[PDB]
Amino acid sequence: SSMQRRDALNSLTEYLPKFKWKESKEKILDIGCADGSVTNIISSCCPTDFELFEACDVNVKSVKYATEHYGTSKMRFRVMDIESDLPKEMKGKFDHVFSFYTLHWIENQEKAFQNIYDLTADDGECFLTLLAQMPVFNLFDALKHTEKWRHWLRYIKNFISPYYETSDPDVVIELLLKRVGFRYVDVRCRQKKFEFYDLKSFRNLLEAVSPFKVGQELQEELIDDVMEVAKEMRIIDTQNSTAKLIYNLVVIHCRK
Amino acid sequence: SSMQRRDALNSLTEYLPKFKWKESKEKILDIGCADGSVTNIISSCCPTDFELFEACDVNVKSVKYATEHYGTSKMRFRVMDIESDLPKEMKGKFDHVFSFYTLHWIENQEKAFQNIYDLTADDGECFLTLLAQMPVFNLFDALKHTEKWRHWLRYIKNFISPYYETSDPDVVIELLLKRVGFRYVDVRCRQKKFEFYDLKSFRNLLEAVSPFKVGQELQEELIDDVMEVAKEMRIIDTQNSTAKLIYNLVVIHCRK
Ligand SMILES: Nc1ncnc2c1ncn2[C@@H]1O[C@H](CSCC[C@H](N)C(=O)O)[C@@H](O)[C@H]1O
Ligand SMILES: Nc1ncnc2c1ncn2[C@@H]1O[C@H](CSCC[C@H](N)C(=O)O)[C@@H](O)[C@H]1O
Q: How far apart are the C-alpha atoms of A153 and A142, rounded to whole Å?
A: 11
Q: Which residue of B has its CA nearest to A165?
A: B193
Instruction: Tell whether A68 lies on the interface with B, counting CB pairs under 8 A.
Output: no
Spatial distance between the Cα atoms of A143 and A223, rounded to a whole number of angstroms: 9
Boundaries of every domain in chain A: 1-255
Q: What is the resolution of this structure in A?
A: 2.9
Alpha helices in chain A (DSSP H): 2-15, 37-43, 60-70, 109-119, 135-144, 169-179, 199-209, 216-232
Q: Taking Cα atoms as reference points, which of A109, A138, A127 lies closest to residue A229? A: A138
Rounded alpha-carbon distances, angstroms, from residue A51 to A22, A43, A77, A123: 12, 12, 15, 18
Q: Cα–Cα distance between B89 and B27 in angstroms, integer?
A: 13
- Count Cα neighbours of A123 within 13 Å in the Cβ-side half-sphere: 4
Question: What whole-number distance in Å separates Cα of residue A61 and Cα of residue B231?
Answer: 40
Q: What DSSP line would sit under chain B, residue for residue? A: -HHHHHHHHHHHHHHGGG----SS--EEEEE--TTSHHHHHHHTSS-SS-SEEEEEES-HHHHHHHHHHH--SSEEEEE--SSSPPPTTTTT-EEEEEE-S-TTS-SSHHHHHHHHHHHEEEEEEEEEEEE-S-HHHHHHHHHHTSTTTTTTTSS------TTTT-SSHHHHHHHHHHHTT-SEEEEEEEEEEEEESSHHHHHHHHHHH-S----HHHHHHHHHHHHHHHHHTTSEETTTTEEEEEEEEEEEEEE-
Interface check for A189 against chain B (CB to CB < 8 A): the answer is yes
β partners of residue B202: none
Does B6 contact ligand 2 (Cβ within 6 A)?
Answer: no
Q: Are B106 and B200 in contact (CB under 8 A)?
A: no
**What class is the B1-255 domain?**
alpha beta
Give, to the nearest 10 degrees, the angle between helix B135-144 and helix B199-209: 70
Chain B residues in contact with A248 (beta carbon < 8 A): 189, 191, 248
* Orientation of helix A216-232 relative to helix A199-209, angle to 10°: 120
CA dist B54 and B77 (Å) reads 6
In this structure, which long-range contacts are made by residues A55-58, counting pairs with CB atoms below 8 Å and at least 24 apart in sequence? A55/A29, A55/A30, A56/A29, A56/A30, A56/A31, A56/A32, A56/A80, A57/A31, A57/A32, A57/A33, A58/A32
- Reduced to 3 states, what is the DSSP secondary structure of residue A12? helix
Spell out which residues of chain A touch residue B232, defining contact as CB-CB under 8 Å.
232-233
* CA of residue A59 to ligand 1 center, whole Å: 8
Residues 6+ apart with CB under 8 A from A214: A222
Ligand 1 in reach of A180 Cβ (< 6 A): no
For this PDB entry, the determination method is X-ray
Q: Does B165 touch chain A (CB under 8 A)?
A: yes
- Give residue B127's Cα distance to chain centre: 12
Instruction: Tell me the shortest Cα–Cα distance from B99 to chain A, in angstroms.
Output: 20
> N- to C-terminal Cα distance for chain A?
32
Under 8 Å between Cβ of A228 and A208 = no
Phi-psi region at A40: left, alpha or beta (left = phi > 0; alpha = psi -120 to 50): alpha
Residues of chain B numbered 197-256 and touching chain A (CB < 8 Å): 232-234, 239, 244, 246, 248
Contact A138 B234 (CB under 8 A): yes
Residue type, A256: K
Nearest CA in chain B to A170: B190
Instruction: Give, in degrees to the nearest 5, the angle at Cα B15 between B14 and B20.
Output: 145
Burial class (CB in 10 A: 0-12, 13-18, 19+), A189: buried
Residues B255, B116: contact at Cβ < 8 Å?
Answer: no
Helix, coil or strand: residue A233? coil
Closest CA to B144 of B205, B203, B238, B229: B229
- Phi/psi region, residue B23 (left: phi>0; alpha: psi -120 to 50; beta: rest), is alpha
CB contact under 8 A, A168 and B133: no
Helix axes B216-232, B135-144, angle to 10 degrees: 110
B244: which chain A residues are within 8 Å (Cβ-Cβ)?
A: 165
Please count the CA atoms within 13 angstroms of the CA of A55 that sit on its side-chain side: 31
Distance set, CA A141 to CA A132, B135, B237 (Å): 15, 17, 12
Yes or no: say if A132 and A248 are a contact pair by the CB < 8 Å rule: yes
Asked if B74 contacts B53 with a C-beta cutoff of 8 angstroms, the reply is yes
Mutate to test the interface with A, among B160, B234, B235, B251 (most CBs of A within 10 A): B234
Note the residue count of chain A: 256
The rounded radius of gyration (Å) of the Cα atoms in chain B is: 19
CB-based contacts of A164, cutoff 8 Å, min separation 6: A104, A131, A132, A133, A134, A137, A138, B246
Asked if A125 and A255 count as a contact pair (C-beta separation under 8 A), the reply is yes
**A:B CB pairs within 8 Å:** 69
Count, residues in chain B: 256
Residue of chain B minimizing CA distance to A232? B232
Asked if A233's CB is within 8 angstroms of B193's CB, the reply is: no
- Closest Cα partner for A106 from A163, A168, A29? A163
The residues facing B94 across adjacent strands are B120
Q: With beta carbons less than 8 A apart as the criterion, state whether A125 and A96 touch.
A: yes
Verify whether ligand 2 is closer than 6 Å to residue B57 (CB atom): yes
Measured CA to CA in angstroms, residue A232 lies from A238, B139, B229 at distances of: 9, 11, 8
Residue A181 DSSP class: T
In this structure, what DSSP letter does residue A97 have? E
Kindly determine whether residue A170 and residue B164, on different chains, have CB atoms separated by under 8 Å: no
d(CA A247, CA B4): 22
The shortest C-alpha distance from B154 to chain A (Å) reads 15
